[PDB]
Amino acid sequence: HMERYENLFAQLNDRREGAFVPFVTLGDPGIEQSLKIIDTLIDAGADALELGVPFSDPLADGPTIQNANLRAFAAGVTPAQCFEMLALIREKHPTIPIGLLMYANLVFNNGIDAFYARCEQVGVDSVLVADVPVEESAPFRQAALRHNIAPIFICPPNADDDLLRQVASYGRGYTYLLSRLPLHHLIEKLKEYHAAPALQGFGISSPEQVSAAVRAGAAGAISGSAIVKIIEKNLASPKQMLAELRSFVSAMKAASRA
Amino acid sequence: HMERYENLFAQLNDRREGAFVPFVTLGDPGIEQSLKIIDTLIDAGADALELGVPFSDPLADGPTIQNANLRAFAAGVTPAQCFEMLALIREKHPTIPIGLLMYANLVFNNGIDAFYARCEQVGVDSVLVADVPVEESAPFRQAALRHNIAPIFICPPNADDDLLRQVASYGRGYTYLLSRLPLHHLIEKLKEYHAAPALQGFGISSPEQVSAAVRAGAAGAISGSAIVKIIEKNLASPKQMLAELRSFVSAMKAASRA
Amino acid sequence: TTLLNPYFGEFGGMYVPQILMPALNQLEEAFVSAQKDPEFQAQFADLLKNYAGRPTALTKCQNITAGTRTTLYLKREDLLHGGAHKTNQVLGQALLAKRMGKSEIIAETGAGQHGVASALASALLGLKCRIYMGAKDVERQSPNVFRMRLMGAEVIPVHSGSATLKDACNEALRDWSGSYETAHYMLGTAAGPHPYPTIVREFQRMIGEETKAQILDKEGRLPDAVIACVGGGSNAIGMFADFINDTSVGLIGVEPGGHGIETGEHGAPLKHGRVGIYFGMKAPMMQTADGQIEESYSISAGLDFPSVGPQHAYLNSIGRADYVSITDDEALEAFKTLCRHEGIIPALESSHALAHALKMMREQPEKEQLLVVNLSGRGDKDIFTVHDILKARG
Amino acid sequence: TTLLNPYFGEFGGMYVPQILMPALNQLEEAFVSAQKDPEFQAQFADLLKNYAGRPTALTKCQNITAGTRTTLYLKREDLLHGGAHKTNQVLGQALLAKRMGKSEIIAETGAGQHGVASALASALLGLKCRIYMGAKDVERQSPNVFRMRLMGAEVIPVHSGSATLKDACNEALRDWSGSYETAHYMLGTAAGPHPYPTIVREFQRMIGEETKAQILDKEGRLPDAVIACVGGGSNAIGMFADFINDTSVGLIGVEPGGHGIETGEHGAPLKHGRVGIYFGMKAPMMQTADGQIEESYSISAGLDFPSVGPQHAYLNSIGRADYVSITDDEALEAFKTLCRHEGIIPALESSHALAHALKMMREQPEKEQLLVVNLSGRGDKDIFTVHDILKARG
Numbered sequence A, B: 001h002m003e004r005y006e007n008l009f010a011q012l013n014d015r016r017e018g019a020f021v022p023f024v025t026l027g028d029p030g031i032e033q034s035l036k037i038i039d040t041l042i043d044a045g046a047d048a049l050e051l052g053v054p055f056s057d058p059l060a061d062g063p064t065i066q067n068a069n070l071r072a073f074a075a076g077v078t079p080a081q082c083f084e085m086l087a088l089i090r091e092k093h094p095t096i097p098i099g100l101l102m103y104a105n106l107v108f109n110n111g112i113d114a115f116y117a118r119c120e121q122v123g124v125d126s127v128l129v130a131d132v133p134v135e136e137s138a139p140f141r142q143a144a145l146r147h148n149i150a151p152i153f154i155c156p157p158n159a160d161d162d163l164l165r166q167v168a169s170y171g172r173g174y175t176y177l178l179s180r181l182p183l184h185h186l187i188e189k190l191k192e193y194h195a196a197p198a199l200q201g202f203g204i205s206s207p208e209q210v211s212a213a214v215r216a217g218a219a220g221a222i223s224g225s226a227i228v229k230i231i232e233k234n235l236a237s238p239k240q241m242l243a244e245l246r247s248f249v250s251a252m253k254a255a256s257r258a
Numbered sequence C, D: 001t002t003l004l005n006p007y008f009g010e011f012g013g014m015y016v017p018q019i020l021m022p023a024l025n026q027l028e029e030a031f032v033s034a035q036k037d038p039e040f041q042a043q044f045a046d047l048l049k050n051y052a053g054r055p056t057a058l059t060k061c062q063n064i065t066a067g068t069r070t071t072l073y074l075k076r077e078d079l080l081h082g083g084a085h086k087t088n089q090v091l092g093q094a095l096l097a098k099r100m101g102k103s104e105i106i107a108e109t110g111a112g113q114h115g116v117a118s119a120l121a122s123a124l125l126g127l128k129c130r131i132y133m134g135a136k137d138v139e140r141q142s143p144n145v146f147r148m149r150l151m152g153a154e155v156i157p158v159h160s161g162s163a164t165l166k167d168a169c170n171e172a173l174r175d176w177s178g179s180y181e182t183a184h185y186m187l188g189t190a191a192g193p194h195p196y197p198t199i200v201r202e203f204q205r206m207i208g209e210e211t212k213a214q215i216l217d218k219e220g221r222l223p224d225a226v227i228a229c230v231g232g233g234s235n236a237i238g239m240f241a242d243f244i245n246d247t248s249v250g251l252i253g254v255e256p257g258g259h260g261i262e263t264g265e266h267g268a269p270l271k272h273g274r275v276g277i278y279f280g281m282k283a284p285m286m287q288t289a290d291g292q293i294e295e296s297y298s299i300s301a302g303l304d305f306p307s308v309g310p311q312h313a314y315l316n317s318i319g320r321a322d323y324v325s326i327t328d329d330e331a332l333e334a335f336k337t338l339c340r341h342e343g344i345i346p347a348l349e350s351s352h353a354l355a356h357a358l359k360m361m362r363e364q365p366e367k368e369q370l371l372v373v374n375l376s377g378r379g380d381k382d383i384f385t386v387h388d389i390l391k392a393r394g
Ligand SMILES: *Cc1c(COP(=O)(O)O)cnc(C)c1O
Pocket: C084, C085, C086, C113, C114, C188, C189, C190, C229, C230, C231, C232, C233, C234, C235, C236, C302, C303, C347, C349, C350, C376, C377, C378
């Protein structure tokens, strides 16, 4: 256990800061370009990463991420190639927390336990299984804990109190909060139930929303599609893509210092 | 009443001869050519004529006559134009018996009685209504007798004795015999029942069959399609059409002298 | 001499070549005998119940009549095996052919539905089946002719005349006159020479018999009117027959009005034709002033028969049934209405009946009336037709 | 927490995003309540009887089995309104949506038949209906999409992924997760997340219940085997359900074998796939060695679902049901056989079931066996397909 999320949230609370976590699809638009994209995200001030593995049927993703998956498939990106990227990323950046957004079949394919063992070996910190609800999560979260992986769970805006209790009890690392039923209710109830720190990930596309999520009590914000949009718009110029990526992330991260 | 069939069969029996009656479609392939065709048939030795009026749906006619009807329609031949041809024919040939092959609708169209009145006025001698059986013939044959027209009836090869009696009792001019149940039975039974003289019209296409029909006891032969075939074959040369018409009819008519 | 009356008043008869009369007399005597045979009646009902899907449903259309005092039911002959009511009577006629010891079937067809119905009955009952079709109709109905061939039928194009239905009807009669010893002519409507008008009615009359039992079950009373399209008259006389003696029940037949009666381009001879003699019968028909038989125009190919059953002409002349017409555009609008508000794609044929029912409703929306429309077929065969017309505008 | 078991042994479950779980739980509680509601049961049976044509016939095929000791019956779901068995369960689900106070329907469709069935149910019951369809399937099924539009449905092309059925299934789930307050997702097979496998079975089980009553009536005994094609499993589980506790009755499901199992180009995941998690369920599926979901190949488009209902995977694993496969060529031969010898045009889907029954018969022709084949649909939609293949040879 290396405690990367815990150590990050410590360092962030000691400096009155909120976390900014960008999402990108591994291998979008190409493996080498993706690696540069992730290096400029980390250099621009990202506190942690959420990385998606291209899946053929992402039934829980919007159109922006659907096109990212096809750009990565058009580049011939496989799950095995993603775990090769994950090892190279961890070897360059020992401290940053690296979370995965997975679909259940890529986790179940070669055995659930072996998937989480491969995550631990490459240095992955957390796993969100997009199409596994807490009601079905037992084999997944148990395998994750056995291999020092934090299982991440989404807290939806409609979440009643029994879901809140499960999310608080079952999750680790951070709670994936989709919200703004009252927003301040969910964040305080999750704290009341000793949940992992809540990160807001609904429509986080501007510096102003990163600032608003922190004031609401959440520990930070996840940008679900905004980073992938910048990639898709600057496909013709990989150089200007990285500059616009570095500019945006620095905007969002400075928005979290206050 | 001018008694044309009766006078013909008299003249033929007094000279130990059988009748030969060709069929042609009025206006096939054109009105002027049809008139020449009928003049060369009469000149070649035809004893009487059976003339069809082009009808749109000749459900009782084979393909050779179906194409004759379309050649006459392609020439714009109407029932009114046919009765104009019939008057010109009668005015050139006062003695020859002229029979019509009609379909019931052209007879019924403007009133049955008025149709037979128009036949009498133009000099027509007999009317065969192709799609009127003896069971339905009452209004037709009664109108024909009122206007000195002989109603012609087909005697089919299957005809039982009650049909034979009706045909004998209802018909005049001649009996249209389709035959070779025994052929000699039908001809003798028709004579037994005082029927009009029987003309054979099944497959009369050669001089030999005209000779055979007479020996069988029939008073002559009707050539149902052979004349129409010669027309259809020589469409490109109206000159050679008439020569082949004159050659054929003289062959069939000389076959009836014995 | 016949066992049954060949005329309905002045209409009907047996105007065929003499050589065909034995064929018709043999057919009448078998039919009369079959009708009194309880074992024939049980095999016929068995095929109808276990092979064809009878009894068909009677569907109440609540969406279509909302806001009015009309109650509309549809007799669902579209749910019959084959997709149209024609299947009833070819099953009866094919059993009649077997009763006569015949092994072959002759049929003609225009739009292709009677040929498909004859082919499926011949395949089921082990009969060799040849079908005459006008070459212009052969070219226009490539789906239906492939259906016939798949079912083992031999399809013979007819290029004579106008190369449409009436010219197919001629070529079948000629065939039958030489082959009736082994072959049965399976006529496809309630017209032609006796006994075919009577036979086709009696083999289609379960339509009305079921409707009566179903309407008494659901409403406790007979309908104010039953409405059916009239091409040759078989589906309409099938609906009408059991109601003829219920005088309070209106009988409405709907002929195709085509582009409009005044245009001349229609198929409504019963009301806008003239009595004639063709196809073995005396009936109103589509004919020139000369007496040459013309074709019937309709957007719906199955209403192409240029004449009408003689019992309908008789029922009209005594005032027992009333006959109207519905144009192409009226029928199309009824086609779209049934699809959008009841989820039923009707045959463009049956859309004429429904279109008149909608007119009865819409013209007098406060009139209390219980209407039954005979939905004679489904309209999947028509979606390509309706598609072309509707994008021809917008 | 659920009121019913979401698993059939190891198969099934509710593998959806957390945001969709309230939608599924609300649907389960309404369904459980609807099942105990005699008034819901009476409206459902009413629509089935008076709108859809139920009960369907059970046809004995004597020509097809002559010379053998096989007796073959066909359960005639092809005579159902719409031409396929799908109509049963969309009527049930649309009534369920009304029970939940919903006014809108979401559906996906591949070959177009579930979209047409959803559209007709939505039109009948006054529901606004949007249908997601893969763009490649939209281009291939222009008749069926016009049917949907005629019936008032909005058809939305899906260009993501492979642009086929599975990519339509994804886009409907996403829609529902944001709109489930007003809209009901009308899933079209006995798969997906609980409670849909259970709901689709219970709304299709009259198929087997009728077959049992009809086979007891005509033969005095249960069948030796009931046989049904398996695309997603709805028509097969509908036939199987009432026979599961009659242990002496064999249950045979027929997956599409495509060009042949050994070619890789097939659609038989239950026997030749691998357990996976997709579309809200744990079930065998068509997947790469990596875990990416592939498509299912079949000449018959309606068997394109790349997985299978979890109750079928369960029934297989305990040995209660047996599952086989039938190739394109075997299915085509069965299509031609039924047309020529029974006058019935079967859907190429149902031709797989019949083709296996013919194999059971032909391989052991002296075996005494009473077989029921579920004829899940009519095959008019397939004549153009069969025409092309048959002239591609001769
Ligand atoms: C054949 C056809 C008609 C017309 O035939 P009728 O003899 O007038 O009944 C009507 N509806 C459908 C569906 C048809 O196929």
